[PDB]
Amino acid sequence: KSKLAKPIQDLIKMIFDVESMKKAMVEFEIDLQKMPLGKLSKRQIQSAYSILNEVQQAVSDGGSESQILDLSNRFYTLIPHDFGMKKPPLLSNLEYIQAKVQMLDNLLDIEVAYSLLRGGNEDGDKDPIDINYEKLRTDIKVVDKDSEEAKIIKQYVKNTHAATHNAYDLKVVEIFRIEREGESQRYKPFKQLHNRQLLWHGSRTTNFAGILSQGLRIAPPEAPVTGYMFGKGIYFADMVSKSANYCHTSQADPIGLILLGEVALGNMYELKNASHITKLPKGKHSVKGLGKTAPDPTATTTLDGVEVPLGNGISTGINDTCLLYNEYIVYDVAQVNLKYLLKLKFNYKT
Numbered sequence: 001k002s003k004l005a006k007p008i009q010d011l012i013k014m015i016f017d018v019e020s021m022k023k024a025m026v027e028f029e030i031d032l033q034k035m036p037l038g039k040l041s042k043r044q045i046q047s048a049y050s051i052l053n054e055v056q057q058a059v060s061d062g063g064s065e066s067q068i069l070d071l072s073n074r075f076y077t078l079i080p081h082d083f084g085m086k087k088p089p090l091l092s093n094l095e096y097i098q099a100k101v102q103m104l105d106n107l108l109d110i111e112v113a114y115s116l117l118r119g120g121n122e123d124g125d126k127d128p129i130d131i132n133y134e135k136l137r138t139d140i141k142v143v144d145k146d147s148e149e150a151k152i153i154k155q156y157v158k159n160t161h162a163a164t165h166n167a168y169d170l171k172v173v174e175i176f177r178i179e180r181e182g183e184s185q186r187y188k189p190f191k192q193l194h195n196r197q198l199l200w201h202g203s204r205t206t207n208f209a210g211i212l213s214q215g216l217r218i219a220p221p222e223a224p225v226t227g228y229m230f231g232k233g234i235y236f237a238d239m240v241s242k243s244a245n246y247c248h249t250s251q252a253d254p255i256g257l258i259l260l261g262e263v264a265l266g267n268m269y270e271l272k273n274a275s276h277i278t279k280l281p282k283g284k285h286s287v288k289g290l291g292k293t294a295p296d297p298t299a300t301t302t303l304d305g306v307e308v309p310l311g312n313g314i315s316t317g318i319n320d321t322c323l324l325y326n327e328y329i330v331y332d333v334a335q336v337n338l339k340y341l342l343k344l345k346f347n348y349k350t
């Protein structure tokens with residue numbers, strides 16, 4: 001049997017659940033009959049990104065309609081979709097193409113999860129759970145519900161739950177202290193930077209085996225820069241509300257996972273509107289999309305020398321901004337060090 005604590009066992013079973021992986025794919029409208037979990041390959045996903053990149057270019061620059069039709073057929077043949085009784089939409093709308101780029105970001109993590117699940121499991125001397133936990137190469141520990149660490153994090157969750165996102169409540173079910181192998185090391189150089197903060201990152205539960213084993217990562221070279229609001233970086237938030245939405249939970253499936261990572265922001269290049277950033281201005285270390293609401297700068301605390309913006313949602317003086325909430329983007333995988341993983345319970349108002 002498993003040597004791991006119960007909360008951690010429940011966590012492993014949850015991130016490796018095969019049924020959740022299928023639900024995710026059915027939701028992206030993939031045809032599970034033509035495209036089973038075992039058919040997914042990284043090369044396949046790379047080519048799909050390239051196709052999306054080309055079609056995105058042809059829509060923007062007014063390429064032939066025959067070109068867009070050809071690219072659409074190749075995309076749907078590479079990744080079989082099931083639209084039921086409706087006709088398949090062409091990749092001729094920039095919003096639809098963005099939807100598809102997002103689907104691929106998720107398929108990248110689902111592919112990692114399935115590969116690990118089917119890997120070296122022959123060992124009979126270890127419980128299946130213990131075997132899959134080791135595959136994550138991440139030390140996971142339960143944070144004592146009554147310690148100072150946990151108090152601060154629960155304060156951060158309670159105070160930063162936005163006004164317009166109150167279509168649900170949030171209950172912190174469990175807090176885990178996580179330390180990915182070799183991560184503290186690649187992050188060392190950035191401890192020299194100032195403006196290091198504890199920020200939020202939400203994602204589907206189906207992405208967590210991939211996130212824990214490979215860490216958070218930027219979209220590959222093939223992905224269009226357009227598929228992302230501020231370019232190809234790693235996104236974070238300071239309001240639990242904003243990130244919580246990327247968890248994709250519902251009344252039917254209320255438990256979500258969310259990360260707190262230490263991010264080396266340094267001098268932020270502040271923006272009020274989207275900008276498909278490629279080059280970062282000299283002297284800048286990250287991007288900060290300015291929002292209408294942000295935590296009260298008055299209440300900001302420190303946790304191991306890292307700033308925690310746990311203040312209550314206060315309205316900032318900027319009005320000429322498109323964003324409702326702040327967004328932080330780093331363009332280097334080494335600029336983040338993950339710290340905690342929270343198990344949240346979304347209580348939907350009914």
Ligand SMILES: Nc1ccc2c3c(cccc13)C(=O)NC2=O
Pocket residue numbers: 200201202203229235236237242243244246326327328
């Ligand atoms: N513009 C964003 C796009 C994606 C995410 C995101 C997050 C937080 C703040 C902004 C964005 C997040 O936590 N996960 C995300 O996946």
